[PDB]
């Protein structure tokens, strides 16, 4: 479970790994980004991490409550306030589900929530595990959940409000490339998402798989630029022994 | 807080930060990395990371034992049973401090224990904050501490048994670099230590300023290499949009 | 006890074995697939594991309660409700059965709950001993219980969300063979049964006894055409040796 | 984490995993096949399972002891006997670690120990984590430790006392095959070692990696096996819907 | 002590021994099978195995609450809440008899419950030591209390959902017959019951005493039917010397 | 785990089943009935219950010590100390396998020791889980270890001190059969061994499969004569009602 | 101490010795038979036997408390809550006397409670030393505390439910006839009690002393009969030499 | 278990039951009376009481060492020094099977030992579970095993050093009817042997089975006589009731 989320001049970017821990020994895949909306309307995207039931639970609720007259995904009138409904309704879950049989099990979980509606931004927010959330701006355009201190670095040396969505979604990629080798818990396939700042379509997205040309070969070639590069390092002074 | 060490071929590698939670309002400069030995004879090394108290009262214990009859670092027959002796001296600091006062507060911490006594090869040890330890191999030849996950990637990638000592120091270095940057608990200066099988000396060590002029350089560096390795990479296919 | 259920494009596949830990020395058989429903309105399928009694008055009092103004498993507006519902009746049995008289006996179970109501796409649901649940996707869509470790490996190779029915159900089958083969636990007769998407129905399902001419017939192939291609791999190179 | 042994007509044969759990969020790869003997005298094989400091100890114990006066895995007069002593250790080391501060932590190890002492058949034992052991037979010819159920049933329906060698290292490399594709605790690279009844040697054994020509191929073959023996079974009859 | 039970298509059949440990060095006769019901209306049977003390406490609590305003065997609208009420009555009995002055002497018991209510099928149930309880169903139509291993084989070969009830109070008393004759701890009089499926009637039941012409018949044909049959059978072959 | 064996006027005969417990979700075939002795002087017995691992031991030590200058079974005087040693071995696994690390599991087993040798009248034992043990006589010339309850009425029945060898066997067999039937931790093959008054030599014993001839065909004719006469008894008289 | 109660169809018959163990060299006269009631509405008897202090502070407790407003021998609406009550009372006096002071010394004690209430049966019970009981029924009418095998035969033989009260107190002195010959802590003076079946009232009771004509008189007889029957048997066949 | 030995003026008569308990759920006949001499020079019978296996043992080791140089019932100079020798024997045993095996166990067991050997008295002893002895004398003439205090009073009514052999021992069967028909450890068959004062043979002794005619004709007298007698009793006074 990683999840990254980039808010940029140019508009939105959104990857989610799928490898989910389901219990014990039962490790599988489950899409971990949502997309909702109105085409010409409003885009607005979900992704998840932490506790499978809880999470999906959440997702199920705004997805049967959409088809009805009443609070919903698409009828919210901020993207802070489709945020707020998420948050809104995943204490309604943690309500239901807690009780002497859960125990000590942890049940919590944290999303992020982006994308535009008409007539103001874009937007993205990030909900935390205690349900109170924060916005990424300017000077802080990316957030991530999950298992993400392994390609954190990445994307702080190069990721800006003003890069492009082409290079974000690389770098991105990077990030993923460098988190599943160092964590297993991390996994493919990915799923991913661009959006155009105020085109107010539902882009299809895509899914990046094990076979994947283009990701295989960044990554073969990543490999091979790191390791060159720390050949061609200079040595360390006699100083240093 | 971060600390790697290396058990390879050619001798050991060990390095560390100095920043340090030590109270609220209160991070400071600690030494994460001490030396103990006799020339021709051993070398051990000590690195520290958790609870600065806990921390301290084992190294201080160690340092005054040795000056003494009885088991200490510098008599100790192997590697093993010295880690097994900070271990020991670990449980024994733990059972003192520990009483209602102490309350919930975490006194826990972690070491490694790495080095060379005359007679059998050099040997790398991990102990864990429940007191139980492992040992470096040649599939597994690196072990971290403390807040490791930004600066595993580069170890993972490039480090293995057969890697010779001056490229393992710069792997490190690249490793401490990316953590620095996206992760303030830890910061510098850095202390590392240089150790070359069978030499039974005990090498003085380097620490890394702000200042240093070879580390401030190999970061400009790496920076401008991976600036360009990322702008020379390809762009994603049709598919991806 | 080992049970399966998929849910695919075309519908859903359940089957069960029926060999059962009723207390020491006592092994017996208990049908663990039962159905529900009204024609032309809904098919809702439940299966079970784990603790006999506990199970068995779940599933008792929900019979009860479908002839019963109030919550039940016929007027349930989704599947979800029904596996909440499922669930609901699990906690209130459990805190029945507790007390000092049980002790440390172990009364946990697990469940599957899956099928249409008429008005919403079919769906599966997993209940786990704690009461949280989680529900098959395309990404994931098979779902286990008991003792499923044996059978699950032929289920990851093979079955995907467009499998076809017939042919996911033969899958389960194979699953059945190797776990029967491999644990006593698990044993004849199984109960099968297979629903239509938005057929509506109530399938009778199928019980495979022992006597089966199909299902002994797809395992002998299935042994003879193993030691086929056992025996026409290739030998392992000098370097093996 | 899984190892399999098998005590067969024309001698054994051994295969082991690499993937480690070496503490939360560190997965990393460690031998769990080592070997021991004098050439023209002796083999002996150990496997490791469960807790890596453990088992790491016991290793480490058994090496240092080969060179010292006492007993030892090189002078002990039987297989049985060797066992015996590897479970001894593994009591010692027990004894040692256990304390407050590993608190509730799980310590426990299982090993396998099987080779041949000059003047006596070749054998195979199983030591249990409470330091139990028992015996391989012609019966019950194999043994597993670890995470053993998903490739069990291609042992039971292949493996018996009479196969011979190659034909059992193929078999035991299919139970990975299926292994690795559904439990991600178990990883490459594997150990194999094969050995001749009576030959007294020490066989230098194998490393198959990811990228291994061999089990490549056969992991292909297999799969479009199973692919082709599962669409030519036969549909079920009316009677089954 | 010994009672079996059986729920059988045409309805069922009760038979319990009397032979009672009472205490040290005093063993007596008490009855076993309890009947409840009011004509027309309703049947209920109770039977009882291990401790005698506590079964009686219970039999007697649920006969004296009949005769009073609130749940009772009389008014439960079910077998299975009838169970559920023995149950029940079960755990008052041993929250009151436990305390320092028992201290480790047993005092579990265990029941059946079995008959039918007027509008609904017959039913049969038996509750463990631990209050937990499970139901007979056509696959499992018996169950068994006490003793029972002995005259297990002869109901697991011959009985089945479909025997009729003459049959299977014959099968019964067959396994008497063995049981007596192999374990001093079961012994006469032994009290039987019928009830016909619907016939709602309370049956007045019969004993068996050590002087029956009809039993002693038929253990004595029985005899003479299994010397015949071991006399008539052919010798093994060569082979088994 | 099964295993039965008689001492009667014309020699001894022995029987055991081979389906063994040895660890959770490892169900396993391994032999329980062990021969010894030289020809012209002794024929011994030993047969196994309990835990695999203390058993095996016991066994394997005999085995490896008849080869040695001291206590064996080859050179004991009599059957009785023979009996004696096995329980002295058993003693000494005890002690060594015993420790904090066996925790709580249960490691005891029973065994039962008979024979003849040269110069007195051929015996038999029963070894308890304590270490005492008893022996046959003519009033009670049978003695059981494991699951027993199943199959001792037929022999109680049938069974005497003067019954013929052919006939003990027979005997043995159907009580196997039954116990089969009625419980699973019981299973084929059989181990068989009939041994003649003063003929003082090993006999080879012989196996018992799944699909022996003569088994087979005794079972279905035994359950066809139970049928048989079960429908040929006569019907309780009126007054059973 | 020696007490028998009968429960017969005609009503109820106590009997107790009075000789106590009142401590070392204190052998004394005690009253082990109380009387408790309201003529017209209510008999109770209790019994006692085992130690002096605890039953005495049980009923000296179960006196002081009919003279108070709550749950008393004299509001209690059955014989069985008499029972509990009792038992109840036990408990608490166990509780109390126990603490380090009293040591290993044996305080525990057992009763009998019989009786009858208006508007229900008579019925008897007796408490066991661990405070739980058992009812006397139609086929096990009488029950005994105290030093009883000595004089349970003859009523084993004779007494029966339907055995009359007079000829059951018969039987019942026969009783302690032989007890008194054949157990020195067995001793008059005796206390008897008859009542009979819907009488209410609260007969005297009768002290049987040292002195008694009909008592003297049957004892003689009795002696006179036994010695006469001997004489007048049959001698035993040459066979039995 | 129970046994009486009574040495009168006109020599010994002894009898034993059969019935043992023999382990949980294996109850099973063993003779409890064993003879030992030589024709014209000594008569000694040994009865056990209490553990089979130690008894048996105790027994067995007996008998082997009477056909060995050394201390033996056979060469032993006096009846006492013979008890002595059994006791000896019995300590022996209890050191050998004590361990922590056996745990709480309970091993101890009783015997008696009398005869005559050319030269001196007949004599009788009986040694308890703590191996000290006592010796019967003409004031107490006889002694008893096992359970014994159901047929102790027609011994102590009626025996004495005078009573004629031939009367004691119909005495004594009246006391095995009693103890029989009240407890179910005692059983038949039974065991007798009379010995005539200064005959030095060795009487072949009798086995009394159920079918005896002697002692079923005695038991049915015996009871039609006491049932007569008590029949014939007066009645109790007025004053009684």
Request: with cysteine; aromatic share 8%.
């Amino acid at each position: 479970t990683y999840c990254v989320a980039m808010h940029l001049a140019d508009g939105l970017v959104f990857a989610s790994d799928s490898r989910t821990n389901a219990g014990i020994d039962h490790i599988a895949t489950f899409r971990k980004l949502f997309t909702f909306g109105t085409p010409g309307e409003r885009l607005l995207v979900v992704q998840t991490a932490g506790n499978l039931a809880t999470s999906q639970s959440v997702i199920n609720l705004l997805q049967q409550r959409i088809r009805r007259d009443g609070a919903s995904l698409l009828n919210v009138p901020s993207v802070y306030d489709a945020t707020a409904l998420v948050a809104e309704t995943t204490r309604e879950v943690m309500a239901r589900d807690s009780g002497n049989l859960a125990g000590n099990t942890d049940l919590s979980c944290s999303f992020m929530v982006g994308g535009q509606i008409a007539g103001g931004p874009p937007a993205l927010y990030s909900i935390y595990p205690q349900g109170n959330f924060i916005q990424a701006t300017p000077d802080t355009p990316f957030l991530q959940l999950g298992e993400s201190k392994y390609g954190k670095p990445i994307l702080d040396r190069n990721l800006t409000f003003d890069t492009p969505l082409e290079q974000a979604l690389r770098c991105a990629l990077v990030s993923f490339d460098s988190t599943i080798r160092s964590n297993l818990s991390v996994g493919m396939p990915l799923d991913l998402l661009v959006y155009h700042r105020d085109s107010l379509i539902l882009p299809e997205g895509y899914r990046v798989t094990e076979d994947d040309a283009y990701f295989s070969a960044i990554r073969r070639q990543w490999s091979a630029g790191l390791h060159d590069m720390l050949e061609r390092l200079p040595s360390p002074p006699s100083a240093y022994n």
